């Protein structure tokens, strides 16, 4: 495998940690709000199976 | 290469159990895992920020169900007093 | 891959070929010509190409073989040493350069 | 709005602690679902193959609005069981439109209303039951790879928390258990059949998987052999989630081990989703041109699902005693022809697919409201029977063992004859509703050259039709070995019934036996709407069947 | 060789060395059914709020390095995130699975 | 004693959090602006970098060519379209140099 | 049909808007004037509906 | 001043029986352009809630306890407020999308557009967005309304990407600024 | 004889009648008896609906009818080359 | 060679190949990268027009910018040169003054306003070049020309003034 450098697409690099921040919000945020309503009801869930009311 | 024995790894699990329930849970993370790393290192093959979001969607996903189902085990523990199939 | 964000924050480096083949298939294929998606097949190959480099692994070591096997037959009498390589375009190297270089 | 009656019940719920609670949270639930409904009956005014929808992650179509409309419905109806007590005291001088509207009645109800039943008392229920609809609506409406799986999770893991939200029972435990640990290995199939698409595709989305498919159909570098597998390994985990064999053998256990009005729920909604799901799935990569892709087709798994189904559905029930697991069994068959439908793609076929499924839940649905129904009218019945005294978990599944249907017709007829007429209508009698569903599908399956399978269909219709048999012989052809409680009308064992007007005032007081006692309102009207529109098909089919005939028009609008 | 890879190797080492002297220098002499109790569902509630709460954590990270693009539309979808997991939270108080008393 | 007062400790503790948040919105504004001033930076020697990387890029991918058709006697064709793609894979000596 | 219509065509705006080299994205202009055309086409039909069809009542 | 470019954006054509007018209008668009009509029907939809609930309570009693029904009756309220505004939301919206007869809008829209060509207006506002966060933000709210009964969204946004092609307005508003022109030289 | 909306008045009647003998209530009692024009009203009312629906039902599908046969026409036309 | 990030490269290839005769030579930049970034505001100042066409140049041809875009490719080398060379005529001094700062302060601009206003100064009264930082905010003074420096390790002398041009 070979590799070289860009100039262009250098000029403000992102972490992964901060490219992921750029989509996750905004663009893909459908998942986000869909892997809410799973935490939600994974807390909800194993709270009503185990513990006496 | 890696992901697709630690897969089988994962299928033998169960091919290789008849009385032992918790490694099922075990065996399922270990699918889980193996799939969540074919698809982390095919994005970092494919620069693609997308996969790696799938992988972390797939974490937390996976943490979330592994809590449901350590919860459904206690439920089921509670009125039995064991995790051992009489096979 | 096609989803166009890649890992420094910058575009997916097959983006260009994804969006390529899309646009494509919209203004080739349709209801009244179904056959004109067969328009796309060279750009879908592109885009399969830029994922996973076959055809460009294949050329590559095809011609590696021939690299090396005529890099043999060749007699190196004084080949540059890595000392010399490292100097290559420097300031006040000039006689490496051209050891190198052959010149 | 779905997620706003989450979001709003979970906070009321998470500061209540009452138990008396449960049956209004509930009512509010029903309430919650008809506004859902109202939504989607607004958002059903344009026509189009599918609409991206919030930066192409979703979709709309009008078959997707029409089923996200069927699930609330359903859902509205299986609410009903933990909205309303099971049993009313009823009297001829508390009848008027003035005494129901202005009077009111005092008497003591616990007991006989079963105020403190075991369903009445769990405030999560309807909360629970509500994510689990997220889930399936979700599914219906993903278009993304992504999408997919976060709505399976969310649809199962609330599927797997009903079946344990019964956490006294030990049977209850037990099923939610099984159901969680074999459908956490379906999942991971479906985890690795999206995965496979995605490290192949270098996509996401569905458009551009069906895009890739479309171009590969013409009639060699990168042959995309990855599509049909891994829809192969995607489909076998939805095979799963449906009970269709030979990934069946889950489905008995865990719908005989939950209670049944859990089970009422659990078995109907999740197919509803999956085989939608599944529809444009079918469609967008069935392969127009035979070429080597149509040689390795994942829509074998489906067809062979089918065969397999119809035949182990059909031969497996000849020997069930206990109800439910019959239930389970029956459901098996009949998935055998859903998915018969569904691998056919052919105009034919999606009308006969989309007639199939909703007949198919409303008549599942007749079943389940019936058995508990008669659970519930044995209050007032005393049996000496040594079986059915060592029976496990009775207040959760009252009726388990066909042998206790045996007379019912002589303990109430009319409901005997509204179960007779559902179980025909699974036979495929004519002109009950279930018969026109199997005619269509044995059209569609006949007409597209499928001569094989119609045949295994038919004579596996005579071998499923001895079990349904057997149930109207118990109900029918004996006498009942259940007789009224000698206690409950002893001719000198009388409740006091105060009735008072608006301002609080004793208008009459009057004596009630256990002949006063009945069938709340609620099933009695489910249960006889319902069974009218299984006998009375031949009268009202021309809209319903029109409804499909235009989706699927739109669908195949080339 | 990297400073980090050497430092592994060092810490790993010094717990070598310690184990190794009393391994080799202390004095050995090998001096050398139950019965099953319930346990408290308390402490797997404990292990659940955390994991579910430490999930919920790690997905508001990236916001924290990406506020400058997110701007106000971001922030929205991070708000309303944060909204739908404190209802959650508030369930957890609420029903007192923490056994407050 | 007034040391332990919630008043003035309460009052204390809201001018040093309002002072310091009148300092971060100082401080943050002007980071912003030393990332303008940076990127204006970078911007400018964009061309000129890029330029000097476009012709190594361009001299390479002849050699590559000249290379192909001079050993294999014609040159295999990866992309149908006429795109500069850079190389994924090179073909390397045997050998390292040998200092 | 054999043709698939895009339930999303605003995926032709999908892209990173940062650290884009130069000509990397490509031309799309035949792409949006494919849409134009189907856009313009389509309020033509509504237009030659009920402006042509309501004139009888 | 035409832009030279008054359909930027690909956008998705939808069949349906009358004109689009805005597939991602403004929420206080959908506001302003609702019919008294929508505002009757919105509020006896969020009474129904509540409503129903109160039926229900005096045919078939819950045998509550003493400040039982007064909880669900709040939570009722809400769930009814909260039903009947997005049902309110929904009939405006939908003659933007030209799914419901739309003539009054169509004309209120050509009215208002072609009064901020004359004023040197954007068509549709200034925003805080980043162009591409405007991208982002328009094709999650475009056509979003009809996911309602499962998801709600509404649209905040100044963006320019409303799926019609804005040639029109141009040519409407140039056509009466020619015609007040000729007023003014007859005078 | 399918007229929908006797059809459907009388469903609403057979849907009162099923359920008091499903409730094993007496069919008349004559404090009940208004819930007869009641089921049967709102039977009424669910064929006006299914009246409606017909009627958008049919415009659609003749429609389709006439889109299939246009696109048939052109196709045909399109082969005579 | 792609441009992905290596992570397990041991060695480097090179290519002695020069370029065909049919391409015009143009000789490279010398000038490492502390004193180009303290040339950059001067080198977009004379060289802005340039620089963009030859990224219009780049845009216009999608997929083969490189080799479709050389000549401009080349008319932006000459035009930096000639501004490294001019700083090198009259502002050597100041120029060495600020990179040498820059190359020991991680190369951060904030931490050499006064080589910077020094040689500002020098450049403006020999090449007539300003520096302009687009969009500043109006309100506030601009960055680069404020006497304090919230971020700067060493507190800047009171006495040392920034240079506003035509003062
Ligand atoms: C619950 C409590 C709600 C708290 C929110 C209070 C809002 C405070 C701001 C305010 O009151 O004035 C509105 C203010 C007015 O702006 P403007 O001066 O008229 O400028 C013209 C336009 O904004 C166009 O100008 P523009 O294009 O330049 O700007 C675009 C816009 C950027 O606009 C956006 O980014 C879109 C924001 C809304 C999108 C989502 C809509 C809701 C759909 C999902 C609902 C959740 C489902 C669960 O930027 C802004 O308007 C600046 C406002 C900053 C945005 C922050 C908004 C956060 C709201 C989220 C609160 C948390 C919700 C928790 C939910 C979870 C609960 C379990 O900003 C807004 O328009 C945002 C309204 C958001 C309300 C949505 C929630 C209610 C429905
Ligand atoms: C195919 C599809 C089309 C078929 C159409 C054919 C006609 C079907 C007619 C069904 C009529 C159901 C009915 O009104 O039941 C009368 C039923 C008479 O039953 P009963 O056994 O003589 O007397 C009650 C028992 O003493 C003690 O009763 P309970 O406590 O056991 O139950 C109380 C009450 C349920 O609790 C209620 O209070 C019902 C609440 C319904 C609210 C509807 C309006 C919501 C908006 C409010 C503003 O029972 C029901 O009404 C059962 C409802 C089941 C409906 C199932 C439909 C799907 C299957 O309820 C009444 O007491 C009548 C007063 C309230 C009538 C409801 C409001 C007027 C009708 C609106 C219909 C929609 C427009
Ligand atoms: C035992 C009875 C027989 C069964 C009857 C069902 C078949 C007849 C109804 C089928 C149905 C919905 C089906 C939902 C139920 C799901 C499954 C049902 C269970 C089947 C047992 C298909 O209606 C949809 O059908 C689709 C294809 O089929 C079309 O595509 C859609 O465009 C069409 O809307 C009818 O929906 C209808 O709702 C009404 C709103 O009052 C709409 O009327 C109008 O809408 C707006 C202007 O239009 C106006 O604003 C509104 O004022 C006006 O009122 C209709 O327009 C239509 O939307
Ligand atoms: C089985 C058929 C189901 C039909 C559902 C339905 O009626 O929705 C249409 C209707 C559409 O309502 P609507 O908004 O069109 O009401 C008429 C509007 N005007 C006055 C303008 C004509 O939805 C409902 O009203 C019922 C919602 C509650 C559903 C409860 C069912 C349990
Ligand atoms: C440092 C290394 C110094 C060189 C090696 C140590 C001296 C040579 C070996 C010790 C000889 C006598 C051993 C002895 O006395 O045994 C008694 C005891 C051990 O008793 P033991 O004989 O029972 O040891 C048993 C050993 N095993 C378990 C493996 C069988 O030694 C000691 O008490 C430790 C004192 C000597 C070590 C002091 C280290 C101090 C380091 C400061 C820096
Ligand atoms: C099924 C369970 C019961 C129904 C739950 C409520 C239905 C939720 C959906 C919905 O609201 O649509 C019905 C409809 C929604 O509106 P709609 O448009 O479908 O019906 C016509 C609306 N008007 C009357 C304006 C023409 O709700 C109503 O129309 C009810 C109006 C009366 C309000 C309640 C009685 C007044 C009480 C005064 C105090
Ligand atoms: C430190 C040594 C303090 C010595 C100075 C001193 O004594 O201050 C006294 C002053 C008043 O107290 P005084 O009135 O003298 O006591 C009663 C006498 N009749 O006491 C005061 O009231 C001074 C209060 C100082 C308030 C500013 C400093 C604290 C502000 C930060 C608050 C945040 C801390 C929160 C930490 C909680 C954990
Ligand atoms: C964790 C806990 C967090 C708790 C936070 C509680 C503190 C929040 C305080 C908010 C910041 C207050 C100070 C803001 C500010 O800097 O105001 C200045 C700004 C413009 O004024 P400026 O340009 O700075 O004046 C020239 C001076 N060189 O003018 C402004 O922008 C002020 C606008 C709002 C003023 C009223 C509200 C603040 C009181």
């Keep these: 495998f070979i590799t070289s450098k860009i100039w262009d697409g250098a000029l403000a690099e992102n972490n992964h940690i901060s490219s992921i921040g750029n989509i996750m919000y905004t663009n893909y945020n459908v998942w986000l709000i869909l892997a809410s309503f799973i935490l939600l009801l994974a807390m909800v869930g194993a709270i009503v199976i185990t513990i006496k009311p | 290469n890696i992901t697709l024995i630690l897969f089988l790894i994962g299928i033998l699990g169960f091919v290789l159990n008849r009385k032992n329930i918790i490694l099922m849970l075990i065996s399922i993370e270990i699918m889980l895992l193996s799939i969540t790393f074919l698809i982390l290192l095919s994005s970092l093959n494919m620069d693609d920020i997308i996969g790696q979001t799938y992988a972390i969607y797939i974490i937390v996903v996976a943490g979330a169900e592994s809590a449901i189902g350590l919860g459904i085990l206690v439920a089921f523990y509670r009125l039995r007093g064991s995790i051992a199939i009489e096979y | 891959m096609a989803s166009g964000y890649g890992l420094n924050g910058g575009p997916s480096r097959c983006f ?72 290559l375009g420097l300031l006040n190297k000039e006689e490496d350069t051209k050891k190198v270089h052959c010149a | 709005m779905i997620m706003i009656s989450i979001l709003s019940l979970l906070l009321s719920t998470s500061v209540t602690l ?68 099971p049993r009313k005291v009823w009297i001829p001088e508390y009848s ?39 889930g399936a609506v979700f599914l219906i409406s993903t278009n993304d790879l992504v999408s997919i799986f976060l709505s399976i999770e969310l649809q199962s893991y609330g599927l797997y928390l009903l079946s344990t939200i019964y956490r006294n029972s030990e049977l209850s435990t037990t099923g939610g258990l099984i159901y969680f640990l074999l459908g956490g290995l379906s999942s991971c199939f479906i985890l690795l059949g999206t995965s496979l698409l995605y490290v192949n595709s270098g996509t996401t989305s569905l458009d551009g998987l069906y895009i890739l498919n479309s171009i590969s159909d013409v009639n060699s570098w990168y042959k995309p052999y990855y599509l049909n597998f891994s829809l192969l390994i995607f489909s076998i985990g939805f095979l799963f989630k449906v009970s269709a064999a030979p990934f069946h053998f889950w489905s008995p256990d865990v719908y005989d081990a939950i ?10 909604i999740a197919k509803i989703s999956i085989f939608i799901f599944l529809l444009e799935l079918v469609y967008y990569t069935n392969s127009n041109a035979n070429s080597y892709l149509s040689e390795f087709s994942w829509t074998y798994a489906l067809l062979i699902s089918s065969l397999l189904s119809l035949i182990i559905g059909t031969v497996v029930g000849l020997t069930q005693f206990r109800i439910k697991r019959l239930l389970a069994y029956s459901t098996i068959s009949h998935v055998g022809f859903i998915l018969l439908a569904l691998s056919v793609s052919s105009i034919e076929s999606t009308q006969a697919f989309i007639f199939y499924l909703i007949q198919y839940s409303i008549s599942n649905l007749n079943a389940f409201f019936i058995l508990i129904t008669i659970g519930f009218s044995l209050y007032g019945y005393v049996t000496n029977n040594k079986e059915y005294k060592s029976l496990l978990d009775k207040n959760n599944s009252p009726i388990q063992l066909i042998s206790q249907l045996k007379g019912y017709f002589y303990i109430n007829p009319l409901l005997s004859l509204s179960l007779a007429i559902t179980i025909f209508s699974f036979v495929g009698v004519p002109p009950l509703v279930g018969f026109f569903a199997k005619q269509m599908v044995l059209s569609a399956a006949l007409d ?72 709340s309102s609620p099933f009695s009207i489910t249960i006889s709407i319902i069974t009218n529109v299984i006998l009375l098909f031949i009268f009202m089919n021309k809209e319903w069947l029109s409804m499909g005939t235009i989706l699927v028009q739109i669908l195949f609008s080339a | 060789m990297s400073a980090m890879s050497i430092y592994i190797i060092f810490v790993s080492i010094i717990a070598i060395l310690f184990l190794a002297i009393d391994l080799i220098f202390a004095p050995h002499n090998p001096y050398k059914s139950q019965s099953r109790s319930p346990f408290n569902i308390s402490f797997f509630i404990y292990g659940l709020v955390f994991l579910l709460l430490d999930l919920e954590i790690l997905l508001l990270y990236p916001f924290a390095v990406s506020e400058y693009v997110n701007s106000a539309y971001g922030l929205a979808a991070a708000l309303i995130f944060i909204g739908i997991i404190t209802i959650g939270f508030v369930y957890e108080l609420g029903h007192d699975a923490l056994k407050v008393h | 004693r007034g040391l332990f007062r919630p008043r003035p400790l309460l009052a204390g503790a809201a001018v040093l959090m309002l ?81 | 049909s054999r043709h698939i219509e895009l339930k999303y065509p605003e995926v032709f705006s999908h892209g990173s808007p940062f650290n884009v080299p130069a000509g990397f994205y490509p031309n799309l202009d035949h792409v949006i004037e494919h849409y134009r055309k189907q856009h313009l086409e389509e309020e033509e039909r509504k237009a030659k509906k009920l402006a042509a069809a309501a004139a009888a009542a | 001043n035409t832009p030279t470019q008054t359909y930027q954006f690909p956008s998705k054509t939808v069949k349906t029986d009358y004109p689009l007018i805005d597939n991602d209008p403004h929420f206080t668009r959908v506001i302003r352009y609702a019919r008294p ?86 068509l549709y506002g200034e925003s805080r967005l980043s162009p591409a966060m405007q991208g982002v933000a328009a094709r999650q709210s475009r056509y979003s309304a009809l996911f309602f009964g499962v998801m709600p969204w509404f649209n905040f946004v100044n963006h320019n990407q409303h799926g019609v092609d804005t040639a029109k307005y141009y040519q409407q508003a140039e056509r009466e600024l020619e015609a007040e022109r000729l007023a003014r030289e007859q005078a | 004889m399918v007229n929908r909306i006797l059809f459907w008045t009388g469903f609403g009647l057979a849907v009162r009648f099923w359920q008091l003998g499903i409730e094993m209530r007496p069919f008349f009692n004559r404090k009940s008896l208004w819930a007869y024009p009641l089921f049967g009203g709102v039977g009424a009312s669910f064929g006006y609906w299914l009246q409606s629906i017909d009627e958008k039902q049919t415009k659609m599908l003749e429609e389709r009818k006439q889109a299939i046969l246009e696109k048939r026409a052109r196709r045909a036309q399109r082969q005579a080359e | 060679m792609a441009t992905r990030k290596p992570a397990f490269n041991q060695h480097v290839l090179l290519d002695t190949t020069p370029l065909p005769d049919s391409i015009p030579k143009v000789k490279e930049i010398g000038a490492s990268s502390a004193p180009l970034l303290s040339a950059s505001f001067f080198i977009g100042a004379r060289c802005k027009d340039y620089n963009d066409d030859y990224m219009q140049c780049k845009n216009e041809n999608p997929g083969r910018g490189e080799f479709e875009c050389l000549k401009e490719g080349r008319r932006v080398t000459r035009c930096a040169r000639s501004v490294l060379k001019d700083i090198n005529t009259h502002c050597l001094e100041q120029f060495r003054a600020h990179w040498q700062c820059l190359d020991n302060n991680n190369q951060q ?18 090449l007539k070049l300003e520096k302009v930082i687009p969009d500043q905010p109006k309100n506030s003074t601009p960055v680069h020309l404020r006497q304090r420096q919230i971020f700067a390790h060493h507190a800047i002398p009171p006495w040392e003034r920034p240079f506003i041009p035509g003062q």
């Design chain 4, 448 to 519: 597209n050259g499928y001569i094989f399978l119609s045949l295994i269909a038919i004579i596996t219709s005579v071998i499923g039709a001895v079990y349904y048999l057997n149930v109207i012989k118990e109900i029918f052809f004996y006498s009942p070995e259940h007789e009224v409680n000698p206690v409950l009308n002893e001719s000198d064992s009388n409740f006091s019934l105060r009735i008072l007007n608006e301002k609080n005032v004793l208008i009459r007081s009057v004596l009630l036996k256990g002949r006063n006692i009945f069938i």
């Design chain 6, 19 to 99: 002072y310091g948040w009148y300092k971060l919105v100082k401080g943050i504004r002007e980071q912003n602006e030393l990332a303008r001033e940076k990127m204006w930076a970078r911007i400018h020697l964009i061309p000129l970098l890029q330029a000097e990387e476009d012709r190594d890029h361009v001299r390479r991918y002849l050699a590559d060519q000249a290379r192909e058709k001079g050993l294999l006697g014609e040159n295999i064709k990866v992309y149908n379209s006429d795109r500069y793609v850079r190389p994924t894979f090179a073909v390397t000596p045997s050998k390292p140099a040998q200092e």
């Design chain 4, 259 to 268: 209670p049944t009005i859990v089970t009422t729920f659990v078995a109907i």
């Design chain 8, 37 to 122: 009509s929508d505002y009757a029907h919105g509020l006896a939809a969020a009474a129904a809630g509540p409503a129903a609930l109160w039926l229900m309570e005096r045919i078939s009693p819950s045998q509550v306890g003493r400040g039982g029904f007064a909880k669900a009756m709040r939570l009722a309220g809400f769930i009814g407020l909260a039903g009947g505004f997005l049902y309110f939301y929904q009939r405006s919206i939908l003659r933007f999308y030209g799914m419901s007869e739309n003539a009054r809008e169509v004309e209120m829209d050509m009215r208002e557009m072609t009064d901020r060509v004359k004023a040197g207006l954007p």
């Design chain 10, 109 to 126: 601009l904030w931490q050499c306003r006064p080589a910077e206003w020094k040689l500002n100064k020098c450049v403006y009264e020999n």
């Design chain 4, 18 to 85: 009452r138990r008396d609670m449960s049956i209004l949270f509930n009512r509010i639930s029903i309430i919650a679902l008809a506004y859902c409904i109202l939504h989607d009956t607004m958002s059903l005014s344009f026509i189009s193959k599918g609409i991206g929808l919030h930066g192409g992650l979703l979709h709309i179509t009008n078959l997707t609005q029409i089923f996200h409309i069927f699930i609330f419905i359903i859902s509205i109806l299986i609410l009903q069981l933990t909205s309303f007590y």
């Design chain 4, 96 to 134: 008027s439109l003035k005494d129901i509207f202005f009077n009111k009645i005092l008497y003591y109800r616990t007991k006989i209303i079963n105020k403190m039943g075991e369903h009445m008392k769990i405030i999560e229920y309807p909360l629970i039951l509500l994510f689990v609809i997220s």
């Design chain 3, 16 to 87: 260009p070929f994804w969006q390529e083949l899309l646009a494509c298939y919209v203004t080739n294929s349709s209801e009244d010509n179904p056959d004109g998606k067969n328009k796309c097949i060279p750009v879908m190959e592109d885009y399969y190409e830029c994922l996973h480099h076959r055809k460009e692994a294949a050329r590559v070591r095809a011609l590696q073989a021939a690299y090396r096997e005529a890099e043999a037959k060749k007699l190196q009498e004084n080949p540059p040493t890595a000392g010399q390589i490292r100097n």
